[model samples]
Target: LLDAHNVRVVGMGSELVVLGHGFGTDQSVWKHVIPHLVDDYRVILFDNMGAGTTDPEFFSFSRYSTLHGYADDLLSILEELEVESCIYVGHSVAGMVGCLASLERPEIFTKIITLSASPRYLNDRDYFGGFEQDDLNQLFEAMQSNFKAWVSGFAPLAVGADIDSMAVQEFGRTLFNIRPDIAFSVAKTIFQSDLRIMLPKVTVPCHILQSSKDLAVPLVVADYLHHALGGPTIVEVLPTEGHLPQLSSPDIIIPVLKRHLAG
Candidate 1:
């Protein structure tokens, strides 16, 4: 199963660092920053069931319909590796996936770092999660009707400016790599998920990294995560835009990740 998901484990150190890619993209998304940390820390990377080169047969709509399913997958990977603990770096939906996994087995996770993560995507009373239910519904519809067109449009907005940038093209390529049915299902699951109540259950320390201007995650959401988490938390607002800072601005993101890793 791990091989089916294209899991790759590299480096060697006293501490392990697990990098979980966000929606649409796969482990390759961390290509820019992985080189810097491999010398000092063990690193693990894998594709989410529906994304990347993972076999489409591995994706189960019922199983992956909720974030807990993804968390279970994370736990299973650790269990298989016989790893007792590691630092988790989760981008977008993977952040909450790490949180859920930590809540299930805190001893398996030493700390978690989140990039542009939100417990809920839809705004509720007194909450600003950066989208509305209607907006997400429309997005899902668009994905269903025309996945390519959606990728073409979504990629630019997700990476902010520099539409011609290789990073944006990389993101677009991954978006198109996913099977349409699987993509729609995973997208629905992500948008509909509401982990607000579960935030306080995370016992491991957390570092919430927010972009200055993310289309999917607002700055205030990072503040909300800091306040809602039960364990020690720190917030670092990156001076960049769009959702995938690791792709768009790795130079800016790497130092912050290292600084947090040091503490």
Candidate 2:
């Protein structure tokens, strides 16, 4: 259905550009960058089932138990639009979703650009996933016990803002938009995911845009991804913090995206 996750398509060009948002946000995440590429590329954006204003009834816990479910939805969107191939720009969890989709249908993606993404969130041996199991447990508990407070506390850290800042409030608005039950489920699934093995299977050209001081994705994780990916890979470390650079530092992000798109 066209209404699935409130899809939006804009721009006009022979080449297609698909933008995917991360957890706690929607298509509006790409609002700042759309203007720069509209004249030269067809841009598509959509909300994940449980995020944004998507009707909660469309969400299936059974189907969305893993990132694969979201990947399937992405593939469906491209298939429905009759898209043959496109440039993919994905943030946070959407990055892994793009990787999975590219593996399933490699021909559909001309290139992929990932921002502030990580295959795993929990640390294991030499891997620095940036969080410990206990840390995630506490975060999940906060989300389950009191979603409002969790959002209030989390938005600040996620966006690298003080609790009273406007950025945190903006992130809070989107975080609160999600169903509490679904939020907990999605958070657990995202934190527990480990897609390192699948990295080598992705043959599409990939550009990994990493934040230098992100709370979620560490610099070492970017190195891991570059080493693991089988395709032509490039990793650019942006001098920024937080997971949502597109929102927190649009000027920096827009130029990086442009440079990659032009390359």
Candidate 3:
């Protein structure tokens, strides 16, 4: 219901592009992956509200803190730019936002790439995504209690347990860069927002790339996503430890993304 809006534009000739990052990180998290797209794509990157890496004042808990709120922003960006159609690449929870935006305005989205995303964070009777309502509640409490300490635990778990690796260091910086308040609220929104209701409305083609062993999003969640999505979806399971593959293993992530784009 909100009007589309945009904060920046890349250039005239490049394809109208929009890249949405996960809760903990900002647009810079995708730096490595986007470079591989230099040949034929014009890229656009922006931070979601609540993450101060973009703008603190712009953060509106009432407007954001929900999947639909984020989707409105995504649609607003495309409409503001007057983009006819463009590929949307989203990571983590942003993936759900992208999926919802496509459902709302299929005419503006050519395709969607979902990386390390889970349709539902809370594990159910038939699913296990390493998250229970209480677990997320505890996580939220921890974040609210002591954010810096929480980042230490959160950063590594996001990309598997290999936090000492060089790749993880880079990814951690992005994950740990958010303001504590924004981080807390964003995390709450991501885990609580359920997109199962929106799945049947999606009409755009989707490509889902998942880490082989994601610590944050379980493999079964991805399978459920494939079945629940209303459109044709191609799923790729890459050998990775956990979330944030764009940083931990760009070698694998970038190539897979490029191949999807090429077709």
Candidate 4:
């Protein structure tokens, strides 16, 4: 429904609807990743307000402070594009957004494929994620003060022990390129919101792709998601490093993706 250089984008096939990419990045982040699915899937790619080459106007402060806002965008895009249903594949922040959107409109998405997705960014009771309010506060301040410097530090921190990996560079560049103010605001929203209450509401079939060690999203959170969502769930703790295995450890992860998409 939305115009991208006057080329109209219609709905894709009935098989899948891949909602790839993470926060601080856009759909193009999946360029290398998407080629793997092109032959089998009619992939849908669009930029979030802050990243990608999409319309920046869609990036609103009041609108995108939580998962609900992103869900709104996702659902709206599918509706406008005339997509009836799809299998949603979301990475990082988009994972929660996918869950929220699916819960809101279960008829639109049949299955959810999440990578490095944590229902809550910060740790809480029984959650082992290594983050606290103070750390996130510092992150927001750093992004607002100097987004470039924040990316240098935040990139590695975001992925946790895998800064030297290829995916960090790709993800880092995208994070650094975003407008600092918007980046700060977005980061604040992501780290602060708690999705524990929302997780149990999910009705769609779910897949939690967990890295053996992910910086931002700990394995425990994935465990939380698997238990909370309750049924028809597949939890894979791949022997990969960092948050983005699609780049860091595709050898082990891609096969799983291939198999998942095949079935």
Per-residue accuracy of model 3 over 1-263 as CA lDDT, tens digit each: 11122254454445656778887676777778666665668777776765645556556778775688888877776676677889888899889899988878898888898999888878777767677888888888988888878777777777666658765676667666777777777777778767777887888888888988887888887777888889888889988776888877888788888788777
Kindly give the stretch of ten consecutive residues in candidate 1 with the minimal lDDT sum: 51-60
What does candidate 2's lDDT look like per residue over 150-235, in tens digits? 88888898989677766567778998899888899999999988998899998999999999989988899998988899999999
Candidate ranking (TM-score, best to worst): 1, 2, 3, 4
Residue-wise lDDT of candidate 1 within 1-263, one digit each (tens)? 67966778898666799999999799988999899888878998887778858887756788987898889988888888887989999999999999999998999889999998999989999999889878998898898888899999999998787779988999999988988888888888898889999998888999999998999988899999999999999999999888999898998999999888778
Using lDDT as the measure, which candidate wins?
1
Residue 56 of model 3 has an lDDT of: 64
50-136 per-residue lDDT for model 4 (tens digits): 663555655578888777877887888888778888888888888888888888788888789899988787777777666898978
Best by TM-score: 1
Least accurate 10 contiguous residues by lDDT in model 3: 1-10
Q: What is the lDDT of residue 144 in candidate 3?
A: 82
Candidate 1 local distance difference test against the native: 0.89
List the candidates' TM-scores in order.
0.97, 0.97, 0.90, 0.89
| Candidate 3 residue runs with Cα over 4 Å from true position | 1-16
Give the C-alpha miss distance for residue 169 in model 1, angstroms: 0.2
- On the 0 to 100 scale, the lDDT of residue 204 in model 1 is 95
Against the unseen true structure, what C-alpha lDDT does each candidate score? 0.89, 0.88, 0.77, 0.75
